[PDB]
Amino acid sequence: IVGGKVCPKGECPWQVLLLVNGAQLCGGTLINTIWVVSAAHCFDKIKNWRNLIAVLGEHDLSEHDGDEQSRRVAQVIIPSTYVPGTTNHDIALLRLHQPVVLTDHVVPLCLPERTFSERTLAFVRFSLVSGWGQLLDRGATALELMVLNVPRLMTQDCLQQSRKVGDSPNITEYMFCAGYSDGSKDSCKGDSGGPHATHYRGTWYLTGIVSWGQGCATVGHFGVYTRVSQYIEWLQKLMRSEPRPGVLLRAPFP
Amino acid sequence: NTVAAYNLTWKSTNFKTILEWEPKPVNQVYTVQISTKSGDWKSKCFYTTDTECDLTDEIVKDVKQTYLARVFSYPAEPLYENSPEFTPYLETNLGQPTIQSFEQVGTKVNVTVEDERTLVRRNNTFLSLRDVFGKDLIYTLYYWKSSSSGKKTAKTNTNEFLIDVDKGENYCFSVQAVIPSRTVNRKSTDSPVECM
Amino acid sequence: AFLEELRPGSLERECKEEQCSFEEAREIFKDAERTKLFWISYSDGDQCASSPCQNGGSCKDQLQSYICFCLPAFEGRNCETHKDDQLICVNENGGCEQYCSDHTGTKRSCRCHEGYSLLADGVSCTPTVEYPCGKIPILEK
Ligand SMILES: COc1cc(Nc2ncc(-c3ccccc3CN(C)C(=O)CN)o2)ccc1-c1cnco1
Numbered sequence: 195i196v197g198g199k200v201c202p203k204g205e206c207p208w209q210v211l212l213l214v215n216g217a218q219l220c221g222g223t224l225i226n227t228i229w230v231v232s233a234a235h236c237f238d239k240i241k242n243w244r245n246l247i248a249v250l251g252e253h254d255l256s257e258h259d260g261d262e263q264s265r266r267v268a269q270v271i272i273p274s275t276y277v278p279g280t281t282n283h284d285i286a287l288l289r290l291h292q293p294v295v296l297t298d299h300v301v302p303l304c305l306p307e308r309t310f311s312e313r314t315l316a317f318v319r320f321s322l323v324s325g326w327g328q329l330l331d332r333g334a335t336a337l338e339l340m341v342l343n344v345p346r347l348m349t350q351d352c353l354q355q356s357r358k359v360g361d362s363p364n365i366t367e368y369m370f371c372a373g374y375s376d377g378s379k380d381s382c383k384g385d386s387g388g389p390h391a392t393h394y395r396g397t398w399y400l401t402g403i404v405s406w407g408q409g410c411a412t413v414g415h416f417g418v419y420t421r422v423s424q425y426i427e428w429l430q431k432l433m434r435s436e437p438r439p440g441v442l443l444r445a446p447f448p
Numbered sequence: 449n450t451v452a453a454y455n456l457t458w459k460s461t462n463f464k465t466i467l468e469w470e471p472k473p474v475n476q477v478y479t480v481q482i483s484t485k486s487g488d489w490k491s492k493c494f495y496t497t498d499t500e501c502d503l504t505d506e507i508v509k510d511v512k513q514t515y516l517a518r519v520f521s522y523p524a525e526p527l528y529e530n531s532p533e534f535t536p537y538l539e540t541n542l543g544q545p546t547i548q549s550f551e552q553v554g555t556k557v558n559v560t561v562e563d564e565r566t567l568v569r570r571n572n573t574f575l576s577l578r579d580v581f582g583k584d585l586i587y588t589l590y591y592w593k594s595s596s597s598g599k600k601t602a603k604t605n606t607n608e609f610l611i612d613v614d615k616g617e618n619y620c621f622s623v624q625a626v627i628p629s630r631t632v633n634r635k636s637t638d639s640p641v642e643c644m
Numbered sequence: 645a646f647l648e649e650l651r652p653g654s655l656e657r658e659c660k661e662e663q664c665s666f667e668e669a670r671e672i673f674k675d676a677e678r679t680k681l682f683w684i685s686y687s688d689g690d691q692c693a694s695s696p697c698q699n700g701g702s703c704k705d706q707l708q709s710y711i712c713f714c715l716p717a718f719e720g721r722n723c724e725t726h727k728d729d730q731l732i733c734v735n736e737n738g739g740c741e742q743y744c745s746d747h748t749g750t751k752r753s754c755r756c757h758e759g760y761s762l763l764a765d766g767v768s769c770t771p772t773v774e775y776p777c778g779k780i781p782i783l784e785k
């Protein structure tokens with residue numbers, strides 16, 4: 195996260211740290227005791243599918259305390275339409291081998307209904323993005339969980355307020371813009387998969403997922419997030435389905 | 449199947465504020481949203497077939513805030529158009545004033561200007577133009593005796609003028625509301641003429 | 645009546661009580677600027693005579709327009725919009741705290757996410773679990 199602050203311990207309780215072979219991979223969001231939502235591009239170069247770990251209650255990567263819980267990832271589910279190395283359909287649904295225990299430090303983020311998300315949550319101006327990703331583009335990562343407040347834009351406004359500099363892939367109906375074009379505040383590489391959480395009438399909900407991070411806070415560009423409301427039905431169906439032998443499952447979308 | 453609204457215009461006087469736009473809808477309805485640059489969007493005039501939307505209740509919550517509105521076109525992301533920014537306190541037209549009364553005390557005349565009601569409310573009652581603007585609002589009096597060639601002018605920080613007149617002569621008056629700190633739209637239309 | 649024309653010039657007799665045209669008022673005022681000042685408000689007419697303010701609203705005349713002051717439950721240029729007829733899920737979530745369900749014929753109904761139940765007021769939600777989703781326990785949930 196560039197331009198953010200440290201999330202005070204326990205104040206982003208749904209944040210997940212994904213590790214592969216003990217190394218920091220991506221972010222994620224706990225939506226219940228068993229399921230975690232992350233980004234599909236996070237798993238592009240994974241070879242050791244049995245070495246995936248999700249960590250809940252993490253705050254400081256340099257110190258272990260009694261609040262951290264670890265679980266093996268039993269299944270990564272990605273939409274079939276997703277094409278590795280690209281931006282569209284950047285969502286993954288993870289099944290934990292054993293459930294986490296909900297504590298003052300480990301709490302899931304509400305996955306909302308599609309309609310509430312489309313006509314109500316979409317019009318809440320600011321939402322929070324978080325992670326242990328780079329503190330500057332190409333810079334070093336954060337040791338403590340960082341958080342940043344970002345304003346949402348409708349894609350028409352986003353394209354009219356952007357400059358077609360560097361990599362400018364299309365912003366589809368499965369994406370949404372949020373942030374600033376003045377190069378001061380954005381989510382970066384390492385924050386991918388983390389939540390974009392929206393506060394409404396006393397409760398927080400999952401609205402977006404941090405997508406590709408490389409090139410973050412480029413002047414003339416906004417942040418682009420996976421539009422979670424488009425995948426509600428898909429996520430709810432897969433959450434009701436039984437496990438498959440392999441870790442990776444490319445499930446049909448829609 | 450739909451067309452994006454165009455020529456979005458603010459029509460505002462004494463804080464009665466209406467957004468207007470083209471064109472008339474054929475097999476399409478409209479929805480308006482309004483916001484401050486950091487607040488959430490509020491929906492108004494839901495699935496309307498009118499080409500106007502009264503946004504008075506939203507803009508009177510803070511008349512010094514800057515607002516942005518947008519008009520959505522749905523068939524009977526959607527097509528939408530942004531309005532120009534609007535700051536009520538700086539852009540609302542000053543309504544036409546009315547002379548409430550005039551009284552003579554020999555060689556002096558008191559001219560009282562009626563309190564101009566605005567659409568701004570403060571618990572049960574409507575605030576006047578002076579309640580909202582205070583020190584920023586002045587009234588100007590244009591007066592003249594019927595036998596002279598030119599007119600004279602008096603200015604007030606309240607709603608009353610106390611002027612010197614000539615003995616045994618009939619004078620005619622007209623008042624204008626002014627916000628001197630403005631460069632654009634700084635005056636109301638003149639009140640109807642009143643003579644003794 | 646020609647015998648009424650014997651009477652000398654008067655703004656009250658000729659223009660207030662009777663009507664009067666631009667030349668009649670110009671003969672009284674003499675100056676152009678003075679007559680124009682009177683005529684702009686005089687020839688404008690009362691836009692409020694058609695009683696355009698509905699639902700008990702109050703009309704205030706302007707130059708070639710008017711303003712309606714509505715009672716608290718109404719809005720619109722002419723106070724035509726009843727604020728009570730706006731209880732739909734797209735209007736501030738129907739007053740619901742969490743979910744809103746639009747119902748044709750009957751009114752809308754509020755609902756809650758799992759781990760919450762609907763309160764008596766029909767719009768608020770209360771947690772039915774120790775750790776409901778989307779609440780931060782260290783800030784007293
Ligand atoms: C089609 O025209 C555009 C498209 C874009 N597209 C875009 N901007 C950013 C991205 C993106 C897409 C997915 C994932 C991550 C990111 C950017 N990124 C590194 C982040 O969001 C880190 N948080 O795509 C930008 C500008 C234009 C443009 C300018 N004038 C006209 O059109």
Ligand SMILES: *[C@H]1O[C@H](CO)[C@@H](O)[C@H](O)[C@H]1O
Nearest residue numbers: 690691692693694695696
């Ligand atoms: C009174 O009549 C109509 C409303 O009924 C309005 O459009 C006019 O402007 C007003 O004079």
Ligand SMILES: *[C@@H]1O[C@@H](C)[C@@H](O)[C@@H](O)[C@@H]1O
Nearest residue numbers: 700701702703713714715
């Ligand atoms: C004018 O104002 C409206 C709001 C109502 O109170 C009317 O009764 C009054 O004449």
Ligand SMILES: [Ca+2]
Nearest residue numbers: 254257258259
């Ligand atoms: Ca730790």
Ligand SMILES: [Ca+2]
Nearest residue numbers: 689705706708
């Ligand atoms: Ca008039």
Ligand SMILES: [Cl-]
Nearest residue numbers: 265266291292
């Ligand atoms: Cl486990």
Ligand SMILES: [Cl-]
Nearest residue numbers: 563564577578
């Ligand atoms: Cl006043």
Ligand SMILES: [Mg+2]
Nearest residue numbers: 649658664668
């Ligand atoms: Mg005559």
